[PDB]
Amino acid sequence: DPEFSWWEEKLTHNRLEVKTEAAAGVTTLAVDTDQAWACVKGDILMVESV
Amino acid sequence: ATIAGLRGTGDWGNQERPTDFRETILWMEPNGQAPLQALMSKMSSQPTT
Amino acid sequence: GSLAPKSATRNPVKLNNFCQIFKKSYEITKTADATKARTGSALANDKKRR
Prior knowledge:
The structure is cut from a larger assembly and holds three copies of chain A. Chain A has one strand spanning 3-8. Chain A is an all-beta fold. β1 of chain A pairs antiparallel with β1 (13-18) of chain C, so a sheet runs across the interface.
C-alpha cells in the first residue's frame, strides 16, 4: 500500500509520585491520576532518594 | 494501562484489531429462461462488405 | 502457600508514513543517436546524468 505503519513499545519502571504528604503510621497514600492501576497486591515499593 | 486482569477484544489499540472479511464479491445477475443476449442467440449471422 | 496475584498489561504506539513518486526523463533525436561522438554514445551519457 502507499501508506504503511508500524508499532513500537518501550520498557519502563513502575514509578509513583505521592501528591499528599503522609506521616509515619499512615496506611493509605494518594498518588497521581491513574498511577495506582499498575501496582497490585504483593508489590514491594521503596522510597527513593536524590 | 489496563488493570481489569482480562484482556478483551475492546482492550486493543486503534487499528490493532481487524475484523473478519470475505475476500470476494458475490454477484447478482438478471435471471430468465433465455440467455442474457436472448435476441442474439436466436439469430443468424452473415458477413457484410 | 499464598494465592497467585492479579494481572495487568498495556498497548504500544503507532507510526506511519507515505510513498512518493519520482520521475526523471531524457530525450534525444534519432539523428543524434545515429551519429558518433568522441565522448561516447549520447543516449547512455544522458541516461547516466539523469
